[PDB]
């Protein structure tokens, strides 16, 4: 009952393998700190912690396939795979974007349905919806922000919030 980084992948997997609903992936956004010489501030930054992808034109496909192979070094690549992948390089200043707003105000932000995502004025919600997501969720924890996405419209269930609560840290 006080989780650490070594179980984080296991807990993310547990979260959407045990889920009653059809979630496409889970992401954990870990906090880090970015000191700025210019102001002296140590701003909280949410960056990629870990993730678990479950899942379910030809030029674009060529590029994506090309990117996959390059990454292997260092068959279709679906929209949600790509979104999951592209998500790995994103980060968020505390208070900004879906994870940063979630973390700053210790919030559950539950966006269900395409219009909820496009009406949120939130950039990552908009990107998710472009890649076919219909539900996006951010839940602040003690150590960052848990995010869930799905290509289906999923209502907030108490079962899911229960599992979340048993798999991450809270104050």
């Amino acid at each position: 009952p006080q989780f650490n980084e070594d179980t984080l992948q296991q807990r993310l997997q547990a979260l959407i393998e045990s889920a009653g609903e059809n979630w496409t992936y889970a992401i954990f956004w870990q906090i880090s700190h970015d000191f700025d010489s210019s102001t002296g501030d140590n701003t909280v930054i949410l960056g990629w912690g870990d993730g678990y992808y479950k899942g379910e034109n030809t030029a674009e496909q060529e590029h994506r396939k090309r990117v996959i192979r390059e990454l292997n070094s260092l068959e279709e690549v679906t929209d949600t795979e790509w979104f999951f992948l592209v998500s790995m390089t994103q980060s968020f200043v505390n208070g900004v974007g879906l994870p940063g707003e979630s973390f700053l105000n210790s919030r559950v932000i539950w966006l269900s349905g395409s219009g909820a995502l496009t009406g949120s004025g939130c950039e990552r919600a908009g990107q998710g919806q472009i890649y076919g997501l219909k539900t996006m969720v951010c839940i602040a924890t003690q150590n960052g922000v848990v995010e869930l996405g799905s290509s289906e419209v999923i209502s907030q269930s108490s079962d899911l919030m229960h599992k979340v609560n048993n798999l991450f840290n809270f104050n």
Binding site: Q9, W48, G49, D50, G51, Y53, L71, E81, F84, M88
Partner: peptide
């Protein structure tokens, strides 16, 4: 980026299946 590296690794390996 180690956190990204591990996730990337796990993602690609599971992708193979």
């Amino acid at each position: 980026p180690i956190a990204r590296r591990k996730s990337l690794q796990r993602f690609l390996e599971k992708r193979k299946e």
